[PDB]
Design a protein around this motif. Sequence first.
Motif, PDB file in Angstrom:
ATOM      1  N   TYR A 111       0.787  -1.253   0.000  1.00  0.00           N
ATOM      2  CA  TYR A 111       0.000   0.000   0.000  1.00  0.00           C
ATOM      3  C   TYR A 111       0.826   1.315   0.000  1.00  0.00           C
ATOM      4  CZ  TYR A 111      -3.760  -3.283   1.652  1.00  0.00           C
ATOM      5  OH  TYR A 111      -4.676  -4.311   1.784  1.00  0.00           O
ATOM      6  N   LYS A 112       1.617   1.527   1.052  1.00  0.00           N
ATOM      7  CA  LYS A 112       2.541   2.671   1.125  1.00  0.00           C
ATOM      8  C   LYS A 112       3.901   2.321   1.755  1.00  0.00           C
ATOM      9  CE  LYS A 112       3.223   7.252   3.246  1.00  0.00           C
ATOM     10  NZ  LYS A 112       4.066   7.747   2.119  1.00  0.00           N
ATOM     11  N   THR A 113       4.985   2.438   0.984  1.00  0.00           N
ATOM     12  CA  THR A 113       6.325   2.068   1.467  1.00  0.00           C
ATOM     13  C   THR A 113       7.038   3.221   2.101  1.00  0.00           C
ATOM     14  OG1 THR A 113       7.337   2.614  -0.665  1.00  0.00           O
ATOM     15  CG2 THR A 113       6.841   0.253  -0.228  1.00  0.00           C
ATOM     16  N   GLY A 114       7.732   2.892   3.185  1.00  0.00           N
ATOM     17  CA  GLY A 114       8.453   3.869   3.959  1.00  0.00           C
ATOM     18  C   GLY A 114       9.813   4.146   3.369  1.00  0.00           C
ATOM     19  N   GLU A 115      10.584   4.946   4.109  1.00  0.00           N
ATOM     20  CA  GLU A 115      12.006   5.197   3.868  1.00  0.00           C
ATOM     21  C   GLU A 115      12.714   3.854   3.882  1.00  0.00           C
ATOM     22  OE1 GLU A 115      10.554   5.594   7.915  1.00  0.00           O
ATOM     23  OE2 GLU A 115      11.015   7.475   6.927  1.00  0.00           O
ATOM     24  N   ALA A 116      12.947   3.333   5.084  1.00  0.00           N
ATOM     25  CA  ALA A 116      13.434   1.991   5.259  1.00  0.00           C
ATOM     26  C   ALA A 116      12.442   0.980   4.643  1.00  0.00           C
ATOM     27  CB  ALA A 116      13.670   1.741   6.734  1.00  0.00           C
ATOM     28  N   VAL A 117      12.700   0.605   3.384  1.00  0.00           N
ATOM     29  CA  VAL A 117      11.838  -0.315   2.607  1.00  0.00           C
ATOM     30  C   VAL A 117      11.961  -1.789   3.016  1.00  0.00           C
ATOM     31  CG1 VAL A 117      11.253  -1.226   0.284  1.00  0.00           C
ATOM     32  CG2 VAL A 117      11.647   1.216   0.604  1.00  0.00           C
ATOM     33  N   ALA A 118      10.869  -2.315   3.544  1.00  0.00           N
ATOM     34  CA  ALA A 118      10.780  -3.732   3.835  1.00  0.00           C
ATOM     35  C   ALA A 118      10.468  -4.536   2.570  1.00  0.00           C
ATOM     36  CB  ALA A 118       9.738  -3.987   4.920  1.00  0.00           C
ATOM     37  N   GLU A 119      10.895  -5.797   2.600  1.00  0.00           N
ATOM     38  CA  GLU A 119      10.605  -6.803   1.572  1.00  0.00           C
ATOM     39  C   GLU A 119       9.154  -7.237   1.657  1.00  0.00           C
ATOM     40  OE1 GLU A 119      13.741  -8.495   3.422  1.00  0.00           O
ATOM     41  OE2 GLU A 119      15.172  -8.519   1.736  1.00  0.00           O
ATOM     42  N   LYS A 120       8.781  -8.276   0.910  1.00  0.00           N
ATOM     43  CA  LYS A 120       7.376  -8.659   0.822  1.00  0.00           C
ATOM     44  C   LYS A 120       6.891  -9.675   1.857  1.00  0.00           C
ATOM     45  CE  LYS A 120       3.218  -9.499  -1.026  1.00  0.00           C
ATOM     46  NZ  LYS A 120       2.647  -8.396  -1.843  1.00  0.00           N
ATOM     47  N   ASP A 121       7.339 -10.924   1.792  1.00  0.00           N
ATOM     48  CA  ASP A 121       6.920 -11.878   2.816  1.00  0.00           C
ATOM     49  C   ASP A 121       7.874 -11.896   3.997  1.00  0.00           C
ATOM     50  OD1 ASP A 121       4.641 -14.456   1.922  1.00  0.00           O
ATOM     51  OD2 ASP A 121       4.757 -12.395   1.155  1.00  0.00           O
ATOM     52  N   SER A 122       8.763 -10.915   3.956  1.00  0.00           N
ATOM     53  CA  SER A 122       9.557 -10.433   5.079  1.00  0.00           C
ATOM     54  C   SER A 122       8.864 -10.482   6.483  1.00  0.00           C
ATOM     55  CB  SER A 122      10.022  -9.005   4.701  1.00  0.00           C
ATOM     56  OG  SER A 122      10.466  -8.235   5.803  1.00  0.00           O
ATOM     57  N   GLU A 123       9.674 -10.596   7.538  1.00  0.00           N
ATOM     58  CA  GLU A 123       9.194 -10.498   8.928  1.00  0.00           C
ATOM     59  C   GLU A 123       9.709  -9.232   9.656  1.00  0.00           C
ATOM     60  OE1 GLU A 123       8.840 -13.799  11.686  1.00  0.00           O
ATOM     61  OE2 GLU A 123      10.467 -12.941  12.910  1.00  0.00           O
ATOM     62  N   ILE A 124       8.810  -8.303   9.984  1.00  0.00           N
ATOM     63  CA  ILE A 124       9.237  -7.112  10.724  1.00  0.00           C
ATOM     64  C   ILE A 124       9.090  -7.279  12.234  1.00  0.00           C
ATOM     65  CG2 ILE A 124       9.469  -4.672  10.207  1.00  0.00           C
ATOM     66  CD1 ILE A 124       6.474  -5.046   9.006  1.00  0.00           C
ATOM     67  N   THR A 125       9.735  -6.382  12.979  1.00  0.00           N
ATOM     68  CA  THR A 125       9.570  -6.288  14.434  1.00  0.00           C
ATOM     69  C   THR A 125       8.925  -4.951  14.867  1.00  0.00           C
ATOM     70  OG1 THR A 125      11.641  -7.577  14.585  1.00  0.00           O
ATOM     71  CG2 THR A 125      10.673  -6.815  16.640  1.00  0.00           C
ATOM     72  N   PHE A 126       7.794  -5.042  15.561  1.00  0.00           N
ATOM     73  CA  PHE A 126       7.150  -3.869  16.136  1.00  0.00           C
ATOM     74  C   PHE A 126       7.359  -3.877  17.641  1.00  0.00           C
ATOM     75  CE2 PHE A 126       4.174  -4.678  12.546  1.00  0.00           C
ATOM     76  CZ  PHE A 126       4.220  -3.444  11.937  1.00  0.00           C
ATOM     77  N   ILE A 127       7.629  -2.702  18.213  1.00  0.00           N
ATOM     78  CA  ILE A 127       7.587  -2.499  19.676  1.00  0.00           C
ATOM     79  C   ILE A 127       6.570  -1.426  20.095  1.00  0.00           C
ATOM     80  CG2 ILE A 127       9.958  -3.297  20.102  1.00  0.00           C
ATOM     81  CD1 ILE A 127      10.563  -0.141  20.673  1.00  0.00           C
ATOM     82  N   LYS A 128       5.817  -1.713  21.148  1.00  0.00           N
ATOM     83  CA  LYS A 128       5.209  -0.665  21.951  1.00  0.00           C
ATOM     84  C   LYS A 128       5.301  -1.189  23.364  1.00  0.00           C
ATOM     85  CE  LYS A 128       1.616  -2.642  23.587  1.00  0.00           C
ATOM     86  NZ  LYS A 128       1.244  -4.074  23.522  1.00  0.00           N
ATOM     87  N   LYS A 129       5.687  -0.317  24.289  1.00  0.00           N
ATOM     88  CA  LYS A 129       6.022  -0.767  25.636  1.00  0.00           C
ATOM     89  C   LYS A 129       4.789  -0.951  26.522  1.00  0.00           C
ATOM     90  CE  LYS A 129       7.324   3.662  27.757  1.00  0.00           C
ATOM     91  NZ  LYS A 129       6.300   3.450  28.828  1.00  0.00           N
ATOM     92  N   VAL A 130       5.001  -1.639  27.646  1.00  0.00           N
ATOM     93  CA  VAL A 130       3.990  -2.407  28.373  1.00  0.00           C
ATOM     94  C   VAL A 130       2.966  -1.543  29.049  1.00  0.00           C
ATOM     95  CG1 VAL A 130       3.609  -3.986  30.306  1.00  0.00           C
ATOM     96  CG2 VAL A 130       5.656  -4.215  28.895  1.00  0.00           C
ATOM     97  N   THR A 131       3.376  -0.308  29.314  1.00  0.00           N
ATOM     98  CA  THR A 131       2.537   0.685  29.957  1.00  0.00           C
ATOM     99  C   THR A 131       1.202   0.806  29.190  1.00  0.00           C
ATOM    100  OG1 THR A 131       3.936   2.338  28.840  1.00  0.00           O
ATOM    101  CG2 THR A 131       4.320   2.026  31.191  1.00  0.00           C
ATOM    102  N   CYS A 132       1.193   0.392  27.909  1.00  0.00           N
ATOM    103  CA  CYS A 132       0.020   0.491  26.998  1.00  0.00           C
ATOM    104  C   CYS A 132      -0.964  -0.696  27.059  1.00  0.00           C
ATOM    105  CB  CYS A 132       0.489   0.664  25.538  1.00  0.00           C
ATOM    106  SG  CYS A 132       0.939   2.332  24.953  1.00  0.00           S
ATOM    107  N   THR A 133      -2.273  -0.404  27.041  1.00  0.00           N
ATOM    108  CA  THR A 133      -3.325  -1.435  27.151  1.00  0.00           C
ATOM    109  C   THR A 133      -4.508  -1.310  26.187  1.00  0.00           C
ATOM    110  OG1 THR A 133      -4.262  -0.242  29.045  1.00  0.00           O
ATOM    111  CG2 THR A 133      -2.937  -2.245  29.533  1.00  0.00           C
ATOM    112  N   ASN A 134      -4.646  -0.173  25.513  1.00  0.00           N
ATOM    113  CA  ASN A 134      -5.432  -0.160  24.287  1.00  0.00           C
ATOM    114  C   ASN A 134      -4.785  -1.092  23.266  1.00  0.00           C
ATOM    115  OD1 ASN A 134      -7.823   1.225  24.430  1.00  0.00           O
ATOM    116  ND2 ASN A 134      -7.274   2.701  22.815  1.00  0.00           N
ATOM    117  N   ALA A 135      -3.559  -0.741  22.861  1.00  0.00           N
ATOM    118  CA  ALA A 135      -2.763  -1.520  21.904  1.00  0.00           C
ATOM    119  C   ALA A 135      -2.440  -2.879  22.493  1.00  0.00           C
ATOM    120  CB  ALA A 135      -1.488  -0.777  21.501  1.00  0.00           C
TER     121      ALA A 135
END
Length: 285
Positions: free
Chosen positions: A194-218
Amino acid sequence: DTQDIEDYKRIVACASYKPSREESSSGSSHAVMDISLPTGISANEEDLKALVEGVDQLFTDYQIKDGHVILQLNSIPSSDFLCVRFRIFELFEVGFLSPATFTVYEYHRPDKQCTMFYSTSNIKIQKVCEGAACKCVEADCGQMQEELDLTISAETRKQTACKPEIAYAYKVSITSITVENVFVKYKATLLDIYKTGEAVAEKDSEITFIKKVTCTNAELVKGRQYLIMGKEALQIKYNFSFRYIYPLDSLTWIEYWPRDTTCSSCQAFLANLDEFAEDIFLNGC
């Protein structure tokens, strides 16, 4: 750690004594807590009085020598944590400062002195580590979108999608969840973009997301297909291998169009998702 209580700042300092194999599980001899206050930070004299001068006394004594607040007791519970809370007004602002100390020890032994650093001002910079290499990011607590359908309009979506701040908008399914020292890593296998960033990821690639624990909506579901509208591609480059961590700011979008179909109204959401989808894919806004 210091809390904002709703000016009046306010400290909640806590302790426990190590129970040595030799030692009794009872707890320590009289120990002393010494909370160094940052330059120009008075305490609430009354608050201290309250926990020593109340006959179910947490403490036996108090005093303020220089910057230090000096509490004293008979023993520190090894069963669990024991806390004093007291207010500290910023009686004045010294422009520049450094962190003061929270040091607590057994009176009859200066060598068993545990000193911990802490800051009087609160903000954020998280030291985030990958592959034996560390690189900081700052976290806005993430907010999860309400469900698959809220009569989200294509336009709006693509407004925030093509919002100047956003970098990468694309569909991931989760696979793995870690929970490590303040943060919550999400290993997700990547579907079409849909929309590619600066740092371009591959297709069936595996990314890593972080959001820290203090969060509970996410709060993300294992193996459940999420659209995410991720703002930052964080490309910490460590050891000549270059990776991406993605953060989950409040700004970040979260939505889940699960595969299950024809389950009532669930089909309708698919009409807009695929709409917005093909729209930005073809045209860049």
